[PDB]
């Protein structure tokens, strides 16, 4: 008789899911299994994105129970569970989704030595992204395309991506009764609190498979918007109603099928023949995600600049008290003090926003390095995805993809062309709230009788300017200019 494991790390859904629906397929029991260490925070995460998984795992839980089967959070490290269960569960087949992440290839090969000794079938479909990346690249010459201008022409040439998987059955196999390691109280979903974390989440997105259809729903309510979604044009300081979808961190967890939203955006493409076109189109969004993807996975030391073949090697300043302002939100720029902000409180920033402060960490101003900066946001970006981190990371600081290191966002001018009055300002430095709107993105430039008035002086409730614009965009250009003239 058939007893299965559908193993969760990413691809958190029910929805296509071509690797739980091999698990249900003729099985007499199916064990859905998500493998948690216990000590991860004790060796980094902010609760917002730790928060955001355990919430996801609370939706998967309660879509189990509504078929009669039920969701086992394993403690401890998947090459010494999994050996365990094979046994005592009976297994004959395990299924999961691929992954091409480092620290994937190196555990999932040896959980599939250890389902090879325990006599075990591994399935791993790929539905984590749009393609089979490594197919990409086989079609392409054996390389990555560098350029999206290229990559669309593959994909073009490719076609389609496979259609969504269908819904699994409304009743599942369910797991076996009386099994140890299938205890309830060893196996349910944690909350914050007892993982280690102190203080209370912050963000306003919620994490789940759930919350992920209802966004995307949200997203097509106004078809024409979709249609005519063009990127580069949208908002960065709208907050209250934020200015794109805020789907990253459900495809980052696998909450939304990446296959689903792209078969929902043709749908509209079809009725609207006008409709954007990559890269600035909303299709065109998934294929940056798809085509760094395919870049990442096949470059060594992708997450790095040393021995990283295509990061270029610039010196960057070892400055910590550039860093610390940076990541403390105190560099006496309000545009720039607000967007860090946003991101220790929400853990999401739209994509604009995430350019004012990663140019104004390493090329724009302070000349640090983009891996300090892919820390932080590692950290606390609930939609942290390893390979697009990095990716922006050296897009913005001119290390790949991007060399025009004379474009230099200011941190005054930038914001003030969307919001003028600076309401994003105002919303996450409450200490600027009473500044009249001709000094809120200058606070320094306010006479000191404003600055009274408004309960902000400039030196003691905020910080003065930690560095002049002007004069450090012009060191850092010189910099940038010296730098690639050196790697030739
Ligand atoms: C320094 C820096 C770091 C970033 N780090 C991350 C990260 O860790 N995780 C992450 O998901 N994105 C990252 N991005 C990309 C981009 O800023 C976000 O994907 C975007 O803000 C997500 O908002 P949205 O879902 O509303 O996007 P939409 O515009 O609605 O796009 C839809 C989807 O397309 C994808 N997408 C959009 N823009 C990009 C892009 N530039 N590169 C790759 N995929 C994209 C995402 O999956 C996104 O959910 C980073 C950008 C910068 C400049
Ligand atoms: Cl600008």
Redesign the pocket.
Known sequence: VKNSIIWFRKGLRLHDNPALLEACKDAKHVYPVFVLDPHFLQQKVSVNRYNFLLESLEDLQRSFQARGSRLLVLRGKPEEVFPRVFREWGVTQLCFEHDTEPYAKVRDAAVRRLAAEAGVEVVTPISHTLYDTDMLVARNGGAAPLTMQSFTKLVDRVGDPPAPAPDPPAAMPPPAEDMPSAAPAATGVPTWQEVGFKEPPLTVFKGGETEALARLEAAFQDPKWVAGFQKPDTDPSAWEKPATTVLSPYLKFGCLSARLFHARLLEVYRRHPAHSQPPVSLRGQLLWREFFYTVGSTTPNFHRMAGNPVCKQIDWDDNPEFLAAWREARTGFPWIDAIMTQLVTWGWMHHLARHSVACFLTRGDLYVSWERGMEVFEEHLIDQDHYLNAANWMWLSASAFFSQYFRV??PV??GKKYDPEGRFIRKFLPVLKDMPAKYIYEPWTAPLEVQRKAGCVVGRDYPAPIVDHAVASKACIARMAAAYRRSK
């Open positions: 966002y200011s001018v930038f």
